[PDB]
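Form P-L/3: holo structure prediction, ligand chlorophyll A.
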Amino acid sequence: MTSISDSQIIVALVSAFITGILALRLGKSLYQ
Amino acid sequence: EANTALTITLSTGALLFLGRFVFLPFQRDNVSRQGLPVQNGVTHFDAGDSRAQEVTSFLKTNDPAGFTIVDVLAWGALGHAVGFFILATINNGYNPQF
Amino acid sequence: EWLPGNPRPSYLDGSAPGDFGFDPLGLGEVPENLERFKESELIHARWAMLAIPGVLIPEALGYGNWVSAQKWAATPGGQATYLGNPVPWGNLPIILAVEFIAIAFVESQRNGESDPEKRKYPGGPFDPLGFSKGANLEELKLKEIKNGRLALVAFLGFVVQAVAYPGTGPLENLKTHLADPWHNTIAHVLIP
Amino acid sequence: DVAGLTPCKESKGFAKREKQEIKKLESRLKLYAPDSAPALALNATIEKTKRRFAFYGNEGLLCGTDGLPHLIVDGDQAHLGEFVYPGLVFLYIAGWIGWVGRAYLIDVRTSKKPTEKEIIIDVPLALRIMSKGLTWPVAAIGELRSGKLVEKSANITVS
Amino acid sequence: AHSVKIYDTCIGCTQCVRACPTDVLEMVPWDGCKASQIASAPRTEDCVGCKRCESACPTDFLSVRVYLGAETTRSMGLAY
Amino acid sequence: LLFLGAHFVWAFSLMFLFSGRGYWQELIESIVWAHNKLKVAPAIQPRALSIVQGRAVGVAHYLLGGIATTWAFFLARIISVG
Amino acid sequence: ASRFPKFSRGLSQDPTTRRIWFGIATAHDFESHDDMTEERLYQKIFASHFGQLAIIFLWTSGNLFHVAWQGNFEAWGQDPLHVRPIAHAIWDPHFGQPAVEAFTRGGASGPVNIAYSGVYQWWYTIGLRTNQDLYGGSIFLLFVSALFLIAGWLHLQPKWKPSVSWFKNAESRLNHHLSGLFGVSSLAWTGHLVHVAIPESRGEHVRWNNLLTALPHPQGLGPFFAGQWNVYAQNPDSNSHLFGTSEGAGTAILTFLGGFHPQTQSLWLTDMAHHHLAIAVIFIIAGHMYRTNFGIGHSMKEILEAHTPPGGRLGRGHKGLYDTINNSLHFQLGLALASLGVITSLVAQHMYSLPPYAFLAQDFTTQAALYTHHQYIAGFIMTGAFAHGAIFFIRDYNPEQNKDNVLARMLEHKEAIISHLSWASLFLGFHTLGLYVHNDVMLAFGTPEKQILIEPVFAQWIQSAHGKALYGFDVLLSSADSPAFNAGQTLWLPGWLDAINNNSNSLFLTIGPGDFLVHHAIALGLHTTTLILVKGALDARGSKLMPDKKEFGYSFPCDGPGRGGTCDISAWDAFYLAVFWMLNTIGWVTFYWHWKHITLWQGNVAQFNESSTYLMGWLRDYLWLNSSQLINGYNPFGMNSLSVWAWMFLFGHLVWATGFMFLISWRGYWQELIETLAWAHERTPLANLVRWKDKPVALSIVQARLVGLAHFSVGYIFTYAAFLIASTSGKFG
Ligand code: CLA
Ligand code: CLA
Ligand SMILES: CC1=C(/C=C/C(C)=C/C=C/C(C)=C/C=C/C=C(C)/C=C/C=C(C)/C=C/C2=C(C)CCCC2(C)C)C(C)(C)CCC1
Ligand SMILES: CC1=C(/C=C/C(C)=C/C=C/C(C)=C/C=C/C=C(C)/C=C/C=C(C)/C=C/C2=C(C)CCCC2(C)C)C(C)(C)CCC1
Ligand SMILES: CC1=C(C/C=C(\C)CCC[C@H](C)CCC[C@H](C)CCCC(C)C)C(=O)c2ccccc2C1=O
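OUTPUT (holo model):
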């Protein structure tokens, strides 16, 4: 019986932000 | 019940013997005819694929027949495979009356 | 010559042994194909000629039907009984392995031949009596190819008669034809 | 029998359908005078339905679970009249029409103005060609073997 | 910025020049046909792409060809 | 029956409405080759319908299908409940 | 280069709104960009493929996270047959209170969406049990997507950029891809199954903490290296086994039972394990085929050259095809798309009849949705394969190098191919529509015994050859005397025959005249779509009407009104026309599947068996009958949970209708109308203060065709999806 903690949501959001930064870098490399 | 060591030994020995003595001329001249993967009339390494340079230190031979370690690996793999096929077929326990 | 008065194909002049100009489908138009077909006809025919005595003799002597001769395999046990005597090495796997290795070595040795005439007619160690030295090669080759074609047709008949009458051999079917010829023939299979 | 299909005469559901149709027709009939024209027309329809059901049952048709006839077209000897015989008749007729059309086109092709005969049909020549179509298979095989059926030098585009 | 090409199968009937709505084509002296003239396309910057010239050309296949390309305020036919 | 047939004709008009002439002309070229191979090509050369004719055929079959659908629907409903 | 289309000068210099549209529409076609070299093309493609992989993995991670956060995965796991899975929560400010009440399904505390993707069954079957497992998977997939993004950025750097010769190493790439990406991946999946998922279905709990100590078998790896491979199949699961518990659970890991698990009505897990293990072995062996740096193996060019029939019936054979395929990216893309479309259709056909996931085949809506989804994907993929093959003919084909080989000789008898395809299409169309209309007339006149009902005896014979004992053909597996039945009577045939003779599942459903007619309509659709696509591909380089089409590219509007008119003349237009036929064919297929399964699930198969032989039967008993609850989603008396599906139904009908406007009305009308609008704007007080930067123009001809087709396809898909989901969820039976 589990329900996902709030700190887990914080970790997921931070990881998503880092992945978005990486995607921005890749898109910039593709454009240039 | 089949002896694993005896079966694998016999099968691998038979395949190695076949490769070294029986089918060796056929393998040799067929691989000579199908020389190298070639693009636009030139090999990949000469076309400019640095990762595609053939390794010759791993192809040195001292057998009179020029038998190579990669040949050892191929025929031994076939031998292990045939031996395990025979072992599994013997121990299958499936004996259909045809 | 297979059909009187028929025109003969250009490539089949009539010099090869057993050449009667028979080629309705035009399969021998390609020369290399013709050479390969000559060698393959010789091999198939020699195998059939060497086979059919082993199809007839056991049935004549009993303990054999050339279809029940393979019955011991595909049966748990029975790895025995060559000629009414058990075979000490009759097991299926060893028989299969020995046959494969031996025939593979022999046939690969055959495949290593350059001269097409030597591909078809080796000579030497395969002619211990030197029959190929009596200046009768053409007639001997004609006799060989004729008996071989007859043997090929005979073995095809064996196979088809085994299909039509399961559990029977050739001599049994011959005795059936002789028992009542006018009501025991291929009409019972072609016309149900 | 074939594919678990029962004969129409033996089947129940065929007879049920016949009974239902006859009952509906008689229910319609109940509204009219016995000797009037609508009564005669309804009676004629009833007799036609009876004759149709009898013929279908006696002809040897297979019947499904729902009570309707099914057709067999795999070549069975007991059901040649379902597919093979009408197929042969259609093939004869269609070959006849196609062959006579081709013959008329070929005969018109060598004329003073082929297009005028293409829109305005030469009736006598058309009738002659049409009458000669009885033996079309023999003529078709004849031209196939004689090498006068196909062409070899035809217009094509840039390959 | 369309491109108009003339090929050496031209017979110099001048129909393409008469059909052009923007005066892109003109006739030029030539040798190689009975009329001894051929069509030219100097003002290709004014071509709109209507392909009337191609419709007016009598030849198995066209001696004048129009290849549509980059669009411009003149090619788009804009009055505003 | 006419309800279904009118839905059908209305659908059929869309193939004239949505398509162009060049495709059908090239397909007719291939079919004309097929008829030529057996010496049975017509004297009057087959041609695809013109652009204006394609539009006219499309609109005519479209209108016929739609109006016949409404006709069958109205008549059936009002004869049944009227 | 200066303006928005940085890759195109002609589009950059365009003063109209066409610049924006065409800059969007041609952005991802790298061969057409200005100053494009082969090396840059290959590297850009490689990085874009990395980006696509990252997007896919983020999509999966998002599914996992949203299900773990807002879904009742554990409650569903406790009672799989009585709980509705939850896809994602709803937060719509535009709702009213009745909608909030109506959308509170499951055990949720607010409005939610019920999932129809089947990921609950898939995740439950593979060992996932709690929400922490789903969260860990989501975080791991985030990490994987980050890794692919880093990989793309790195392999675009000047130090790490691969060379053109590296991208053309076909033998080495195929060797690694075949060995690793297939065989080793399936071997690892077998490892996961055996080591984790099979114990989960028997009441065990294996995770990363106890992976190193939990034996998959009581005697692990002893028999495997002793040659006693049969020890791992001694004790399979019992027929009374309860999935997820230890009641009647065996200890075998690689069985070969065949058939279905009685409680879950899905394939056995141990069967799936031996399957993926055998596939792994086969692929790992097949990898060691082509020559590389070690001096052994085949050479694909020599294989292609050697294969050439004597007598010249095939011409020069497959000679010269190696360079043609290696140097053409469109040839490779077409081959890949054709294979992927066939594989997707195979997945769709083989998943509804042999369900692999526990608790599936009881969730009817999920099964229908999965079938329709992957079948539409397959249709689009096939159409794309043919389109990119036509692009190959136009762009990469070199006539001189492909002199008299199979590829050129295909262009050689193209008229024969198109003619015989046209004949097949016409034959099927005439006689099939004739039979349907004849049956309609027979039933209209009240005489249903006069219709032409043809038994599909060939498919029934094949079904009897599989062991179905209903049609009384008694052949092959239906015959107890057959060699095949005797050979297989101990390995797989008990379970397979028990499954195939059951008439409640979807394994080889019974068929009749209606099934015959529908497979024939499907054949008509297939041959006609193939006709259109092949005609477009073969006539791409030129025809009699326009013998120099190859100079005008793949896509162009027309060739003017000369020579009789040349509308829809390019191969792109053949693609455009064939998309309609693809949609129609897939619609027929999905209609047939859905009606047959609705009748099967309701138990009333007689309605399909009787009403499918005529078209009024379809229109009355499928569409009109099953649209009731859909159209009653919201009414003047309130609203249900089907309100969203009713709204989507109307939305799809509307978008599909809107596509007709672009499809029927052409450009000149709109251009003149826009001219009048521009005059109006320039002459209006208080509006002259605002000026456009781009001169407004009407859409292009090809752009109009594309936009019409897009609105059309979106309407088609949304309408049928809404109808399917609503008509299957209102009853759940
Ligand atoms: C063993 C080493 C190895 C491995 C693992 C890979 C793996 C890969 N390479 Mg590759 N490559 C290799 C060696 C290798 N390569 C070598 C040596 C070279 C140079 C000669 C290259 C050159 C190369 C290029 C140039 C490109 C790749 C690309 C790719 C990727 C293809 C896209 C993808 O994920 O498909 C995944 C495919 C599968 C998993 C196969 C599945 C089989 C079918 C489709 C489905 C069956 C599964 C089952 C039925 C469904 C279950 C699903 C579930 C929902 C139930 C893939 C990750 C491409 C890429 O994307 O770049 C990043 C690319 O452009 N490679
Ligand atoms: C049934 C589908 C359909 C629809 C909706 C339209 C819509 C339209 N057509 Mg049209 N057309 C169609 C089919 C359709 N067509 C077909 C099949 C043909 C072929 C015969 C034509 C032929 C045609 C011609 C020849 C002409 C039109 C014209 C018009 C316009 C009418 C005037 C206007 O602005 O309406 C206003 C109303 C609407 C646009 C619909 C209501 C607005 C909806 C509800 C949405 C608005 C809010 C929206 C949510 C905004 C938020 C967006 C945001 C979320 C992104 C309008 C754009 C005429 C035109 O140009 O107008 C001057 C015109 O001359 N059409
Ligand atoms: C020097 C010399 C000598 C000797 C030699 C020798 C001794 C050799 C050996 C060799 C060998 C001895 C080899 C081997 C090899 C092997 C191998 C290479 C193997 C492989 C395997 C595999 C690959 C497997 C796989 C698998 C698995 C894993 C699982 C199950 C399935 C299978 C089976 C598939 C002499 C005296 C003659 C003299 C001269 C010199
Ligand atoms: C135009 C073009 C193109 C395209 C093409 C295409 C798109 C195609 C397609 C095609 C296809 C799409 C095909 C398909 C096929 C399939 C097949 C051919 C299959 C087969 C199968 C079989 C044969 C099976 C068998 C069996 C059975 C029945 C049972 C079980 C067992 C077995 C398995 C044996 C390209 C790119 C090349 C380029 C050039 C141009
Ligand atoms: C289908 C279609 C065609 C093809 C249709 C054609 C060629 C019309 C065919 C009409 C009939 C079927 C011709 C009949 C010929 C004779 C009258 C037959 C006489 C013999 C008996 C049948 C009476 C176009 O040409 C076309 C052109 C422009 C836009 C759209 C389309 C379009 O959609």
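COMMENT: Chain A has one helix and no strands.
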